[PDB]
Design a protein around this ligand. Sequence first.
Ligand SMILES: C[C@@H]1CCN(CCOc2ccc([C@@H]3c4ccc(O)cc4CC4(CC4)N3C(=O)c3ccccc3)cc2)C1
Ligand SMILES: C[C@@H]1CCN(CCOc2ccc([C@@H]3c4ccc(O)cc4CC4(CC4)N3C(=O)c3ccccc3)cc2)C1
Lengths: 227, 214
Amino acid sequence: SLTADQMVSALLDAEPPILYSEYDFSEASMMGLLTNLADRELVHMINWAKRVPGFVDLTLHDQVHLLESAWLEILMIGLVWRSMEHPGKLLFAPNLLLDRNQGKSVEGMVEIFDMLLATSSRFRMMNLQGEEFVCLKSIILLNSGVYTFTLKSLEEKDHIHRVLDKITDTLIHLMAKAGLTLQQQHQRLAQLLLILSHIRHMSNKGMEHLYSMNVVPSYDLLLEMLD
Amino acid sequence: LSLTADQMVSALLDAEPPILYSFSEASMMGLLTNLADRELVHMINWAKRVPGFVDLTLHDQVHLLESAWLEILMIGLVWRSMEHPGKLLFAPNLLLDRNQGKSVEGMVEIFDMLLATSSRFRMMNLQGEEFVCLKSIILLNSGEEKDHIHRVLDKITDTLIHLMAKAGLTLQQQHQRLAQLLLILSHIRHMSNKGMEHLYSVVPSYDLLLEMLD
Ligand SMILES: C[C@@H]1CCN(CCOc2ccc([C@@H]3c4ccc(O)cc4CC4(CC4)N3C(=O)c3ccccc3)cc2)C1
Ligand SMILES: C[C@@H]1CCN(CCOc2ccc([C@@H]3c4ccc(O)cc4CC4(CC4)N3C(=O)c3ccccc3)cc2)C1
């Protein structure tokens, strides 16, 4: 029942803070820093999820399943957003800004590194606004695991698509409030959602890369933070 | 790119590839691998008729096909299997259900993902005009050159909106259904990645795709 501006305001206030890395740089300790960073970010990510409108209306089981499917996607689009204003670099933390040459120590790391840089350049070429970013991240949370889940499950898939419908209206309204014609509204909406296909592709490579090095957050852990 | 929305639909509808034709578990993957191998030629023939595709360089043409070939095979399978609930219609003489995929490690996980996609198509009542547009977007989005690809992608988006507006939908329903269609592409890319992993437990070579394009 939230208006478009009420949906934007709720998503902007639910935004998690930018976390930092340990202060006191070696390429040998890089992965320990990034693993520790992602671990701390996940706790704030679950707090943000529980404040995306309509997310806590679902059962905890489906809340867990949605985060199981989208947690790496959400970390990646967050990284890409933080790195948007720093070409050729990924801003994992304000005190942890890495270029492509430092991502060569691990085999297969640079392939995902270049993919993350390309998405960051894509966001840059579009002048993606923060209000559109929080909408795209909310879509990732609800859509990534809605096709891989009884009448209870049918009722909740219907609710997820209802919430996704409001986020779509919110994006359209944001593009209308900004002065875009109708053709530019539908075209930019399509442009944004098509990027989500590549973020999923990046997430699938990240998962594969992490398995070649306790990779996933467990069901009981995701449930413990959610509950 | 100068075509109208109605001319865009007609071009894609006539470019649709034909339905190819194809008992033990070991012979099952034999038939599936053989079927996909024969379908790739007709998929490339379909790609050449997607408006704006042949304006790309041959190098970029191949790269787009390398990137999208498994997604296009899957979304065409989901479209064929749409009115066969719980089953996957690989070929008219090759209709498989869930049980026939349990004998292979990691097959039922993907079989279920394809069936969930076909179930999503039924709930939305996807039309053939929308299907050929979703297939065209997969080809151009999966992989001067980037500017032209984005112009054709924006062209297919205009054609989709035109189809929904012609069907009497309000604008709210128009951009809602557009969003629902494009969010399925994320899951299709997911299935393609999971399918690639399962198949490697494959990829058409550059030279092979180039030969098929003349
Ligand atoms: C159960 C816990 C929860 C997951 N933990 C297990 C570790 O998973 C992780 C998850 C993420 C990252 C890291 C990281 C950190 C923060 C961020 O905002 C974003 C990212 C992004 C990224 C995946 C791309 N990453 C990379 O390093 C990396 C970048 C380029 C190419 C190769 C890799 C590290 C480890 C255990
Ligand atoms: C260069 C050549 C080009 C590809 N070749 C290498 C073989 O890759 C392939 C590609 C496709 C399939 C098959 C197939 C056939 C026709 C179709 O329309 C669709 C599909 C779909 C699919 C990938 C999902 N598949 C399945 O069986 C299968 C279904 C459920 C769960 C697990 C698997 C077989 C093998 C080499």
